[PDB]
Amino acid sequence: SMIPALRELGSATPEEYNTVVQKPRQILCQFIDRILTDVNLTSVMLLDFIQHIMKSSPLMFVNVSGSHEAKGSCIEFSNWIITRLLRIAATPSCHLLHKKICEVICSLLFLFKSKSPAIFGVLTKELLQLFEDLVYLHRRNVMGHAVEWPVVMSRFLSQLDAPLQLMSMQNLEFIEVTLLMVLTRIIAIVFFRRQELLLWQIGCVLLEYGSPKIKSLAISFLTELFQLGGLPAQPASTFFSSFLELLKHLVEMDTDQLKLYEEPLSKLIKTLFPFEAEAYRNIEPVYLNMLLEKLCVMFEDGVLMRLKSDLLKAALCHLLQYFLKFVPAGYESALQVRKVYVRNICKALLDVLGIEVDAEYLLGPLYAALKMESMEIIEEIQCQIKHVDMNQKSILWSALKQKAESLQISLEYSGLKNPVIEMLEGIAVVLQLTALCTVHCSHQNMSVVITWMSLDFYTKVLKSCRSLLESVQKLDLEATIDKVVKIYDALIYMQVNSSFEDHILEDLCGMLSLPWIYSHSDDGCLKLTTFAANLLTLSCRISDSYSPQAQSRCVFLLTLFPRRIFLEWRTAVYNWALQSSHEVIRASCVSGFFILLQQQNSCNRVPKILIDKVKDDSDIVKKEFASILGQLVCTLHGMFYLTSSLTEPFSEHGHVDLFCRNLKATSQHECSSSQLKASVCKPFLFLLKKKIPSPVKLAFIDNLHHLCKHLDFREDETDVKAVLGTLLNLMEDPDKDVRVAFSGNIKHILESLDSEDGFIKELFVLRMKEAYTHAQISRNNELKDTLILTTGDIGRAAKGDLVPFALLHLLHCLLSKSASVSGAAYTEIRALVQYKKPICQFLVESLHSSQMTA
């Protein structure tokens, strides 16, 4: 390359800058002619060299001064380069080169926008016009007007030059795809609230016509456009119609086509229908009604059954949920029409429920509809506590009961009907939804109680669980175990609500311990256990079916087991959990022992055995133990009465199963006494890792926010010293986000401290001083920022002397006047709302330091 030409580029005057560029521009044009001129995937070397020159000689691509003449000349030269790039792009064979060409051209355009905003605006207008012409050509081809497959389609024409070739209709589609990729890259720079309509037009037309994969890329571009600036009403009608058409087509699509369009299709489904509130207003009411109608058609089509892509079925379910929950009834359409369309969608949902690949997809929407019917029942109660059966109350609920009774009846009826893993999965989805409703349906749960499945139905389900306990030849033993686990979790949630039966509780504990029973049969509680006796034989089979992650789910359920029943069997199961042969098994073991320990006996500090396992179990195990520790501290001596949140499964935690796992238990009177124990904090600190637990540390701070309120504040100076050491460690953590979280929790802690103890305040000031000294030693702006945020949290506390100390820290930054620090003190008073008087004293200190200077 002409490196001396590159140097002359800097040397040349802005007026002669055009001539200076022409010299190396000459070599660049020759290089393009070598490869760019010929149509044809070295040339990649050429495009990379183009990008390297753009980075090296920003002035060469665009004159810095411009002068109003050199700038135009650069516009022409870049237009010629873009013409060569498009010449490369149009051909499908060289399309791959065009994308890297896309990268170079887009980077140079960004560079021009930086240096030459106006010239870049002109180039972008030319690009948008070229896009409009390509869309017009596509429209003429599709509508049936003259194809005009060869055309100059000249745009951003440059006198210095080359010719802009036109691809055959399909290759023109390819060139349009490349233009769409470039526009997707540059969307943010382009959008001006006026060209926005043009971008929406290019996208909507591309959605209407073009390759299904090109259609998918266009869907992605339209999604990015929708995220920024919404959907303009004029674009809205066409985009909504195209979305309805795509929804109808989804059934009649190629599996490869489905794979091409899935991710973009799901992204559009989500962005256009955000689960978050206030999405409803964004789309027009009639458009939303049309979405509901197309969904009704899809449900009639059984698109769930037709769909060969899970993510697409997932997005269809997402639309169902958006209509059920986030779209107010009476906005998209009249109430009764909404109820009718929803009833049809629910009927289709049950039809899919009959045979299911995965229950979760059907789970959520049925959950929302059951919640809506529950609110209806609650309104019935509101206007003139007698339980009304859920199945009788709601047609959909009785329908689900019929489907479940049918699945169980078929399993009992035939051995081949007995071997229907999908039918069991459906029965399981029914049970889980039943448990979620029993948790949340009751208006008193939100007087009358509605149980979709009666306890006798639960017992028939128990008989079905026994049939599943019957060996399946081990071909599906593990999956049968997983489904039995989901059913057991549903029964467990029902028990946490209230134990279904004491013998039912015993049978449940037996099924839960079945996988490891064969190993645990020689156990003191086990041999006594009546369930154990009959169980041992199947456990001989069950042990093979049991798997590590499934075993961990089993251990979690066992910890769920009520203490009243098989408590010693539970303690043995926890001890086996202490074994932690499987790491995920170890994690579930921690989660479960968390409940089991306090129930067993001797309400007191965390078990030393569990503490040791936490000492080194795993990084993930460390995080799970941290998450548990918050509740464990509240429940160390608390009765720990089980508490069930509604937990609407909009984004169910982990698997929809383990929902029983994601439960919270609180003692009524534990809040009465904080009962802070330093050593208990000491084990948590031993769990904490300066860097290893860092995200686990953030979770630990998150739990500490809750834990702090239950802090006795009666600790000895050594114990208060220990808590202050925990806080200083919270500050020390390397993660800046870690420190910000530390201050966030520090707010709750300062609220928690019984009083702004003068000695405690002095210790806090000393910790801050050690931190600032370590900062000055670091000479690290980031540590300075962490300390500044710490002082800001202290001021937001504004607690007692701590309020004066945090004012002193704000004064420290201000006298430091650190460019970042400055104004944070202004926020500091804002966080505030005598401290200011210490500020004047610190100003006196500033005067003394200045006198020291002179």
Partner: protein, 70 residues
Amino acid sequence: WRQRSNTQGSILINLLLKQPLIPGSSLSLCHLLSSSSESYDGSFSLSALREAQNLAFTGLNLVARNECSR
């Protein structure tokens, strides 16, 4: 066959539209759909009239959008 059916549906919308439904008759379809309600009243609440009115509005928009099955 939908397009001719769509014409039929638009025709239904137009019949719903006409200014006098019965010649010499003051009331018009929109007058019914949104009404003063001056005045079975015991059977029918003004709110009951209102909810039915909303059902009617949704229906009119639907009929306009719809294509006839024929």
